[PDB]
Every structure is written in C-alpha cells, then in structure tokens.
Enzyme design. Structure first.
Site, mmCIF file in Angstrom:
data_model
loop_
_atom_site.group_PDB
_atom_site.id
_atom_site.type_symbol
_atom_site.label_atom_id
_atom_site.label_comp_id
_atom_site.label_asym_id
_atom_site.label_seq_id
_atom_site.Cartn_x
_atom_site.Cartn_y
_atom_site.Cartn_z
ATOM 1 N N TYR A 84 -5.143 4.581 -1.872
ATOM 2 C CA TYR A 84 -5.363 5.618 -0.868
ATOM 3 C C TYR A 84 -6.634 5.326 -0.087
ATOM 4 C CZ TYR A 84 -6.111 10.478 0.912
ATOM 5 O OH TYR A 84 -6.368 11.604 1.677
ATOM 6 N N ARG A 89 -8.089 6.894 7.931
ATOM 7 C CA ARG A 89 -7.299 7.658 6.964
ATOM 8 C C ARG A 89 -7.184 9.116 7.394
ATOM 9 N NH1 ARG A 89 -9.440 7.936 0.911
ATOM 10 N NH2 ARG A 89 -9.832 10.102 1.583
ATOM 11 N N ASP A 90 -6.065 9.740 7.038
ATOM 12 C CA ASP A 90 -5.853 11.172 7.282
ATOM 13 C C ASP A 90 -6.025 11.518 8.769
ATOM 14 O OD1 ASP A 90 -5.749 11.606 4.271
ATOM 15 O OD2 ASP A 90 -7.871 11.060 4.480
ATOM 16 N N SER A 96 -12.129 13.253 7.321
ATOM 17 C CA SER A 96 -11.617 12.408 6.244
ATOM 18 C C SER A 96 -12.765 11.736 5.520
ATOM 19 C CB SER A 96 -10.670 11.339 6.788
ATOM 20 O OG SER A 96 -10.240 10.479 5.734
ATOM 21 N N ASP A 138 -0.566 10.940 2.656
ATOM 22 C CA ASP A 138 -1.045 11.456 3.944
ATOM 23 C C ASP A 138 -1.108 10.397 5.028
ATOM 24 O OD1 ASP A 138 -1.854 13.478 5.710
ATOM 25 O OD2 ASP A 138 -3.994 13.101 5.347
ATOM 26 N N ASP A 322 -9.467 20.088 -4.654
ATOM 27 C CA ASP A 322 -8.952 19.564 -3.382
ATOM 28 C C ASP A 322 -10.017 19.565 -2.275
ATOM 29 O OD1 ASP A 322 -6.230 19.257 -4.342
ATOM 30 O OD2 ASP A 322 -6.038 21.451 -4.191
#
Ligand code: MG
Length: 371
Positions: A84, A89-90, A96, A138, A322
């Site tokens: 990941y 990313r994201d 992110s 994601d 999270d």
C-alpha cells in the site's frame, strides 16, 4: 488453486501483543469471558500492512518467525501482506500519508520500494512459506468514479503502471496475489461494474507486458470497511445498489470479470463486519462506533457459500485507528468526526483500546472464549 485450502494463515505477533492491553482491561473489569474472547482474537490471523518503506524492515523478522512457527507446528504457513504505497496515493482524499509523489520521482521510487519487498520475499526462508498479498487498497476504484478529481486524473496511468509492476514482480509459485477491488458501496453500483472489470483486466494486461505469463489469483474486497458478508437487515443507504452486502458484491461483479477474462476469485475482509446498523451513510469509514469483529477467517463453504470466494479474511487489524478525531491534529480528517465515528480516536494506525473492547463485545457470531 485456492491457496487458502489446508493452509494456516499467519498470526501477526506484533498485533497479538497489542491485545494484551485489551485483555488487561477486561481482567480489571472482572470480565473473564471477554478477557478469554480477547485471547481467542490473539490467535486469529490478520494481514501485515506494508504502508511505507520503513515497514519493509519488519518483513524478514516476520518471515523468520513464520518459518520457526512452520517448523514447530507442522503447519502450512500462509503469510498475509498488504502492499500500500502507490505514488500520489489516495488521489481522491483531501490528504494522504503515502510517502511517494509523482512530482518527486514517485513512480521510480515506488518501483524500488517494490524491489525491496521482492528482495525480502526472495530469501531461502521466504521460499519455505506461501504468501497471500493484497495489492493497493484505495487505488483503481478512483479511476472508475473519481476522474473529475485533478490528482486522480494525474495519477491514473501511474496507478495502473505501478500495480502492473507489482504484479509482474511477484510471480512465484509460492505467492498468490489479490488486487484490491474496494467494496460494494463503491464499485457495486450498476454503472461501476463493467468499468471496474475493465480496469482490472487492463492492469493485468500491462503486467503481462513486463512478465509474459503473469497472473493474479483474483480480488480482495471490503478491505478496512464494515460491510456484512450477508446482511440480516439491508440498510436504507444501499437502495438501488445490488451489492448491498459483500456476498452480493461477489455475485454481481463476477459476471463482468468473467466477460473480460479476469479471474473471479475473491478474498473478503470481515474483521469489522459483525454489527450492522452502525452507519447513517455508506461513505462513513473512520472508526465507526460499535463495530464488531465479524466472521472469523475461514474457507468453509458452509459459511462462504460461493465457489468464487477463496476465503473470508481479516485484512484491516481491528484496534488500529483509521485516523484521529482531534480537530487540531496536523492529520485531522473530518471523516473521523462523522456522526457515526467513535471519538476521541488516536492517529491512523495507533492503538485504540476502547474500540477493540467494543469489537469484542459486538462480535458476531460471538467469540468463543479461550480459557
Ligand atoms: Mg507525506
């Protein structure tokens, strides 16, 4: 073949150690049953996430421990990993924690990060084990639904090229790969099904331009989400989505995968899926209050009830936050103060003991105690 059959997915020691705090809490409450249920959780396999380059340092010790366990137990150890770290990313999130950026050589840096993982997965010890690896949560769903977002527009090719390289780099007889495929509430909408199947096939095809006969096992769904495998009370927010639970997501996505020639085998996260009716909107994801541990990892078709599902697994480790609910935190995410979120919560990945207490209490089916 289904790599889960007969195999013993690895218990992640560093995760089991965090649960000692939860056990101590229940013992201090005079609650021996929940203490014992938490002990059961210590023995349930989860995925080890490789979400940054520093975490690569944990892989060889994990492998050495896994081999020792294999020798001691006579089991067929199956190490479960998440990769990941795509650049940019994201892309649809406001923020992110991904460490690589396209404008700072992120594509090349991602390849080298993959190369470092490959090195760790290429030792004589690694060769003794089997691996199940989830690729890039994601990511590709953003190319289906978020192409109006500038960062996603700029990252689309990089996501496909990145995942293609990861697939092409991990073609070994002891490794099975599952590309992340979001969850029913994202890609299960009618308009999203075919484009999703197409992008998974496109990405596999790109992989095959690197390593000619490259394959994957299939897809991973519900990673870090809460959707039930089988609902007992369909939520109002699932109106007009036929993927209103994850078993129905499998059923509805499968034909499109088959049509494009992408393998239609799934692993399904149920680590936080025990309790329904905990959200007011499908898009709520951050530390959803009163979540429960769900169906324990299994390949039992009496539970799984689908030839297209390899296994129910626990990908997101319950208890790892999270995100923070602190409005003043540098990484504050407003999603973590949703009406359905458990507050106060610590930084993403940090231990959230109050939340695990509730995962145990709200587990369904209830956890069998290990006394
Ligand atoms: Mg950063």
């Amino acid at each position: 073949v289904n790599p889960y059959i007969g195999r013993s997915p690895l218990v992640i020691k560093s995760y089991a150690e965090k649960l000692e705090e939860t056990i101590a809490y229940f013992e201090a409450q005079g609650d021996e049953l929940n203490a014992a249920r938490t002990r059961t959780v210590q023995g349930i396999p989860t995925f080890a996430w490789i979400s940054d380059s520093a975490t690569i340092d944990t892989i060889q010790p994990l492998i050495a421990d896994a081999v020792a366990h294999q020798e001691a137990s006579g089991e067929q150890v199956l190490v479960q990993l998440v990769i990941y770290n795509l650049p940019d990313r994201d892309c649809a999130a406001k923020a992110s924690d991904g460490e690589f950026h396209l404008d700072d050589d992120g594509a090349n840096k991602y390849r080298a990060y993959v190369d470092r993982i490959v090195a760790e997965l290429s030792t004589a010890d690694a060769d003794k084990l089997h691996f199940s690896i989830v690729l890039e949560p994601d990511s590709l769903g953003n190319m289906v639904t978020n192409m109006h977002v500038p960062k996603c527009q700029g990252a689309a090719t990089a996501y496909k090229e990145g995942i293609a390289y990861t697939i092409a780099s991990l073609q070994k007889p002891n490794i099975d790969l599952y590309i992340d495929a979001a969850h029913g509430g994202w890609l299960g909408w009618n308009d999203n099904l075919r484009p999703s199947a197409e992008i998974f096939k496109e990405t596999l095809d790109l992989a095959r331009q690197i390593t000619p006969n490259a394959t994957v096992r299939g897809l991973a769904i519900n990673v870090s989400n809460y959707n039930p495998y089988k609902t007992r009370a369909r939520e109002d927010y699932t109106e007009w989505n036929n993927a209103y639970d994850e078993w129905n997501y499998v059923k509805t996505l499968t034909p499109h995968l088959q049509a494009v020639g992408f393998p239609a085998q799934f692993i399904v996260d149920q680590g936080r899926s025990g309790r329904e009716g905990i959200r007011t909107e499908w898009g709520q994801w951050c530390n959803i209050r009163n979540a429960g541990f769900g169906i324990r990892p299994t390949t039992d078709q009496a539970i799984v009830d689908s030839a297209n599902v390899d296994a129910i697994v626990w990908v997101k480790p319950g208890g790892e936050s999270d995100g923070t609910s602190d409005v003043n935190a540098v990484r504050f995410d407003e999603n973590c103060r949703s009406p359905a979120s458990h507050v106060p919560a610590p930084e993403a990945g940090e231990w959230f003991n109050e939340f695990v207490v509730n995962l145990v209490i709200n587990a369904n089916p209830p956890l069998e105690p290990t006394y």
